[PDB]
Design a protein around this motif. Structure first.
Motif, PDB file in Angstrom:
ATOM      1  N   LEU A 216      37.706 -34.001  -1.840  1.00 40.90           N
ATOM      2  CA  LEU A 216      37.346 -32.803  -2.590  1.00 40.90           C
ATOM      3  C   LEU A 216      36.672 -33.222  -3.895  1.00 40.90           C
ATOM      4  O   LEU A 216      35.596 -32.737  -4.222  1.00 40.90           O
ATOM      5  CB  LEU A 216      38.588 -31.970  -2.910  1.00 40.90           C
ATOM      6  CG  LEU A 216      38.325 -30.674  -3.691  1.00 40.90           C
ATOM      7  CD1 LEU A 216      37.531 -29.684  -2.824  1.00 40.90           C
ATOM      8  CD2 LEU A 216      39.660 -30.058  -4.122  1.00 40.90           C
TER       9      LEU A 216
ATOM     10  N   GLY B  54      33.293 -34.531  -3.738  1.00 37.22           N
ATOM     11  CA  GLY B  54      32.345 -33.522  -3.305  1.00 37.22           C
ATOM     12  C   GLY B  54      31.957 -33.604  -1.842  1.00 37.22           C
ATOM     13  O   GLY B  54      30.866 -33.170  -1.466  1.00 37.22           O
TER      14      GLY B  54
ATOM     15  N   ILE C 216      33.675 -32.114   0.709  1.00 40.06           N
ATOM     16  CA  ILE C 216      34.179 -30.976   1.468  1.00 40.06           C
ATOM     17  C   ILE C 216      33.127 -29.874   1.423  1.00 40.06           C
ATOM     18  O   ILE C 216      33.145 -29.037   0.514  1.00 40.06           O
ATOM     19  CB  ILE C 216      35.496 -30.422   0.851  1.00 40.06           C
ATOM     20  CG1 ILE C 216      36.538 -31.541   0.727  1.00 40.06           C
ATOM     21  CG2 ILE C 216      36.021 -29.275   1.696  1.00 40.06           C
ATOM     22  CD1 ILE C 216      37.100 -32.033   2.045  1.00 40.06           C
ATOM     23  N   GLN C 217      32.247 -29.841   2.422  1.00 37.58           N
ATOM     24  CA  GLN C 217      31.145 -28.878   2.461  1.00 37.58           C
ATOM     25  C   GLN C 217      31.449 -27.417   2.742  1.00 37.58           C
ATOM     26  O   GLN C 217      30.700 -26.534   2.323  1.00 37.58           O
ATOM     27  CB  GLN C 217      30.092 -29.344   3.463  1.00 37.58           C
ATOM     28  CG  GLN C 217      29.499 -30.684   3.145  1.00 37.58           C
ATOM     29  CD  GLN C 217      28.348 -31.003   4.069  1.00 37.58           C
ATOM     30  OE1 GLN C 217      28.479 -31.804   4.998  1.00 37.58           O
ATOM     31  NE2 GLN C 217      27.213 -30.356   3.831  1.00 37.58           N
TER      32      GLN C 217
ATOM     33  N   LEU D  70      26.232 -30.207  -9.154  1.00 37.64           N
ATOM     34  CA  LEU D  70      27.605 -30.281  -8.657  1.00 37.64           C
ATOM     35  C   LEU D  70      27.525 -30.301  -7.130  1.00 37.64           C
ATOM     36  O   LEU D  70      26.463 -30.067  -6.556  1.00 37.64           O
ATOM     37  CB  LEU D  70      28.421 -29.083  -9.187  1.00 37.64           C
ATOM     38  CG  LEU D  70      28.386 -28.985 -10.729  1.00 37.64           C
ATOM     39  CD1 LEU D  70      28.997 -27.668 -11.201  1.00 37.64           C
ATOM     40  CD2 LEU D  70      29.136 -30.172 -11.352  1.00 37.64           C
ATOM     41  N   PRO D  71      28.641 -30.589  -6.447  1.00 36.85           N
ATOM     42  CA  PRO D  71      28.653 -30.645  -4.978  1.00 36.85           C
ATOM     43  C   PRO D  71      28.142 -29.413  -4.244  1.00 36.85           C
ATOM     44  O   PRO D  71      28.595 -28.289  -4.485  1.00 36.85           O
ATOM     45  CB  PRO D  71      30.116 -30.925  -4.652  1.00 36.85           C
ATOM     46  CG  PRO D  71      30.577 -31.703  -5.794  1.00 36.85           C
ATOM     47  CD  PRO D  71      29.952 -30.975  -6.987  1.00 36.85           C
ATOM     48  N   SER D  72      27.212 -29.635  -3.323  1.00 37.82           N
ATOM     49  CA  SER D  72      26.649 -28.545  -2.545  1.00 37.82           C
ATOM     50  C   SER D  72      27.682 -28.064  -1.535  1.00 37.82           C
ATOM     51  O   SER D  72      28.607 -28.797  -1.202  1.00 37.82           O
ATOM     52  CB  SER D  72      25.392 -29.014  -1.811  1.00 37.82           C
ATOM     53  OG  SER D  72      24.356 -29.236  -2.745  1.00 37.82           O
ATOM     54  N   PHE D  73      27.533 -26.830  -1.073  1.00 32.02           N
ATOM     55  CA  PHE D  73      28.457 -26.259  -0.101  1.00 32.02           C
ATOM     56  C   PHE D  73      27.868 -25.149   0.750  1.00 32.02           C
ATOM     57  O   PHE D  73      26.876 -24.518   0.369  1.00 32.02           O
ATOM     58  CB  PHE D  73      29.720 -25.725  -0.790  1.00 32.02           C
ATOM     59  CG  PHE D  73      29.461 -24.749  -1.914  1.00 32.02           C
ATOM     60  CD1 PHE D  73      29.360 -25.200  -3.233  1.00 32.02           C
ATOM     61  CD2 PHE D  73      29.387 -23.377  -1.666  1.00 32.02           C
ATOM     62  CE1 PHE D  73      29.196 -24.280  -4.294  1.00 32.02           C
ATOM     63  CE2 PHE D  73      29.224 -22.457  -2.706  1.00 32.02           C
ATOM     64  CZ  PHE D  73      29.131 -22.907  -4.023  1.00 32.02           C
ATOM     65  N   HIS D  74      28.472 -24.931   1.920  1.00 29.23           N
ATOM     66  CA  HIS D  74      28.061 -23.862   2.836  1.00 29.23           C
ATOM     67  C   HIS D  74      29.014 -22.687   2.608  1.00 29.23           C
ATOM     68  O   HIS D  74      30.222 -22.806   2.824  1.00 29.23           O
ATOM     69  CB  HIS D  74      28.194 -24.307   4.298  1.00 29.23           C
ATOM     70  CG  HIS D  74      27.178 -25.315   4.731  1.00 29.23           C
ATOM     71  ND1 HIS D  74      25.831 -25.023   4.822  1.00 29.23           N
ATOM     72  CD2 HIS D  74      27.314 -26.601   5.136  1.00 29.23           C
ATOM     73  CE1 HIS D  74      25.182 -26.086   5.266  1.00 29.23           C
ATOM     74  NE2 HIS D  74      26.057 -27.056   5.466  1.00 29.23           N
TER      75      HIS D  74
ATOM     76  N   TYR E 133      34.263 -27.009  -9.821  1.00 25.66           N
ATOM     77  CA  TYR E 133      33.554 -28.296  -9.864  1.00 25.66           C
ATOM     78  C   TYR E 133      33.063 -28.644 -11.282  1.00 25.66           C
ATOM     79  O   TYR E 133      32.912 -29.822 -11.641  1.00 25.66           O
ATOM     80  CB  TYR E 133      32.348 -28.284  -8.918  1.00 25.66           C
ATOM     81  CG  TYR E 133      32.685 -28.450  -7.446  1.00 25.66           C
ATOM     82  CD1 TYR E 133      33.577 -29.441  -7.016  1.00 25.66           C
ATOM     83  CD2 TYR E 133      32.059 -27.660  -6.488  1.00 25.66           C
ATOM     84  CE1 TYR E 133      33.833 -29.636  -5.641  1.00 25.66           C
ATOM     85  CE2 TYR E 133      32.306 -27.848  -5.118  1.00 25.66           C
ATOM     86  CZ  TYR E 133      33.194 -28.834  -4.710  1.00 25.66           C
ATOM     87  OH  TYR E 133      33.458 -28.991  -3.358  1.00 25.66           O
TER      88      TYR E 133
END
Lengths: 182, 182
Positions: free
Chosen positions: A155, A158, A160-161, B105-109, B171
């Protein structure tokens, strides 16, 4: 007291999913067509943690993205079913598990610009595998078990999509720390 | 190396948004119809923080949910445009602001079961209002300013319903603490 007035609501799809195309009169008096997944509709998400401080997760194929994603067990809440019940049912169906206490975490809208759906996250304690999973046609997933430390490392890195899974982990974190599981 | 084979792909809608109904042969050899928003498509989300430790947010009407939600400035990434550029453009359009550094910051779906869209979050530093907002027909929102302490109190109290905004805040938190803004 909605800012927009419905002119006409057309059903564009009923299944796989229900989609509507609504003609409305906006706050400017002008007309606009909005396509969305109407509500009320919901889904539950549940982070299952064992007494050994591991989590029962799934790696599931999500076709639109063409990827297998690491997720917490989840699924649509059935008609007449409570979010918590759907949570316990999906835990059993997808991971063949049962749990004791389920702590409800803050609900959220995954994408309010397109769908009315509300996602209800939960932290399930003393999760344990008691039966084989029951996957349906259309679903492609496998269950796995990871130490919570590794889950939270991912997590923080980064990795965990799936947004719902990430958010569920962020909301569960203080509870896990409080209970001595993390 | 996709587990599912495309039989036929039908376009169900091109606008407001593009939706497809795909007939595929699954991992069981059986056929299934999947309706989704295809990719590649993306949107950027940006948490704008001022030098005084406040955040420039928006309260925006999201029709599918019938609610005005507290959100970070955001919008679809245009063709040929970078996520960071869309972030700076939406910051300007929605909040009339500009910023200095943007930390990705971390990308996400948001919802991989239905849409290929990838959301790209950013933390914008030294954000400042330099012009009037430029809202488009169809959008109903207002910008506001809140101390970060209040924003994070709401997050912890579970009052931030928009998932993307909540995740962006989670994040961004360590960066804000690191920089002395929180």
């Amino acid at each position: 007291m909605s800012p927009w007035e419905r002119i006409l609501l057309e059903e564009i799809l009923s299944e796989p999913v229900r989609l509507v195309k609504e003609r409305v009169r906006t706050h400017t008096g002008r007309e606009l067509t909005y396509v969305y997944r109407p509500g009320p509709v919901a889904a539950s998400f549940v982070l299952p943690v064992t007494e050994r401080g591991t989590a029962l997760l799934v790696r599931q194929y999500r076709h639109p993205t063409g990827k297998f994603l690491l997720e917490v067990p989840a699924g649509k809440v059935d008609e007449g079913e409570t979010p918590e019940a759907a949570a316990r049912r999906e835990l059993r169906e997808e991971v063949g598990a049962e749990a004791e206490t389920l702590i409800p975490l803050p609900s959220f809208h995954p994408q309010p610009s397109f769908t009315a759906v509300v996602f209800h996250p939960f932290l399930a304690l003393k999760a344990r595998v008691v039966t084989p999973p029951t996957l349906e046609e259309g679903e492609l997933l496998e269950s796995l078990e990871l130490p919570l430390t590794e889950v939270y490392a991912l997590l923080a890195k980064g990795e965990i999509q799936d947004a719902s899974t990430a958010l569920t982990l962020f909301y569960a974190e203080p509870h896990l720390k409080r209970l001595g599981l993390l």
